[PDB]
Amino acid sequence: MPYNLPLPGGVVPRMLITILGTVKPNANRIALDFQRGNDVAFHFNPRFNENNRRVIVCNTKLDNNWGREERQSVFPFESGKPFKIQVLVEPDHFKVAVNDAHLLQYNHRVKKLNEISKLGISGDIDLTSASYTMI
Ligand SMILES: CC(=O)N[C@H]1[C@@H](Oc2ccc([N+](=O)[O-])cc2)O[C@H](CO)[C@H](O)[C@@H]1O[C@@H]1O[C@H](CO)[C@H](O)[C@H](O)[C@H]1O
Ligand SMILES: CC(=O)N[C@H]1[C@@H](Oc2ccc([N+](=O)[O-])cc2)O[C@H](CO)[C@H](O)[C@@H]1O[C@@H]1O[C@H](CO)[C@H](O)[C@H](O)[C@H]1O
């Protein structure tokens, strides 16, 4: 099962979200879901073993349909190891860093950031903490 991080004032530039945890043994997937109503503004989905390969899929869900995926092979997650995911919100994109190192960028497709009221956290991880602050 997952956990939901409420974002009362919605997503706003300068917001920094930090997810601390440990990847479960023989992990299959991890998923962060920034939601706007029934839409998923930003889906960050590390897939550990998809067709015998590790890949990170990012996408947006609108009107119950997923859009064009953005993929990358660099994969900084390992089963059973501690991890830290840091997401910085900029006016133009979500900046994702893993273990204090830039990982990727995802340009905003859903533009009304103020409406993105929560962040779903799911997958094969044990959560230590999931919080946010403004920097
Ligand atoms: C392993 C494989 O041949 N994957 C194909 C396949 O993927 C699926 C997945 C689910 C279902 N289904 O629930 O019915 C059918 C097929 O078909 C896809 C297109 O329909 C892709 O061709 C997929 O290959 C993967 O495509 C992605 C990009 O979409 C990427 O290129 C992957 O590297 C590639 O394996
Ligand atoms: C089951 C699976 O492999 N889902 C993939 C797949 O989806 C399909 C759906 C239908 C067919 N088909 O009828 O031949 C092929 C493949 O490929 C999609 C991309 O082309 C997605 O990768 C889909 O997985 C879904 O991806 C979205 C993000 O794009 C999100 O991660 C969903 O949770 C995930 O199921």
Side-chain angles (χ1 to χ4, degrees), residues 96-107:
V96 178
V98 174
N99 299 331
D100 296 296
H102 178 78
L103 176 67
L104 61 77
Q105 182 172 301
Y106 189 79
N107 287 171

Side-chain angles (χ1 to χ4, degrees), residues 1-5 19 31-33 35 119-123 125 127 130:
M1 46 61 256
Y3 184 67
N4 175 59
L5 169 65
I19 299 174
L32 263 40
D33 286 285
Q35 303 162 60
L119 168 60
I121 306 171
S122 59
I125 66 169
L127 267 193

Side-chain angles (χ1 to χ4, degrees), residues 29 43 45 47 50 57-60 66-67 69 71:
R29 69 189 288 285
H43 180 71
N45 179 203
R47 304 179 181 180
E50 181 197 65
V57 177
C58 293
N59 208 349
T60 293
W66 287 104
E69 301 182 326
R71 301 185 166 227

Side-chain angles (χ1 to χ4, degrees), residues 62-124:
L62 285 172
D63 308 309
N64 208 61
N65 284 306
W66 287 104
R68 287 169 165 284
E69 301 182 326
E70 281 179 42
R71 301 185 166 227
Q72 79 157 52
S73 294
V74 179
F75 200 97
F77 300 103
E78 171 175 22
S79 292
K81 295 301 169 66
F83 76 82
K84 177 163 65 182
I85 296 176
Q86 281 146 323
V87 184
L88 172 69
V89 182
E90 285 287 44
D92 61 304
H93 66 269
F94 281 105
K95 176 189 172 63
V96 178
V98 174
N99 299 331
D100 296 296
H102 178 78
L103 176 67
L104 61 77
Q105 182 172 301
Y106 189 79
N107 287 171
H108 294 308
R109 296 191 192 173
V110 165
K111 305 172 291 301
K112 302 172 192 173
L113 307 183
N114 56 301
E115 307 189 336
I116 301 175
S117 65
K118 88 245 282 63
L119 168 60
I121 306 171
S122 59
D124 307 311

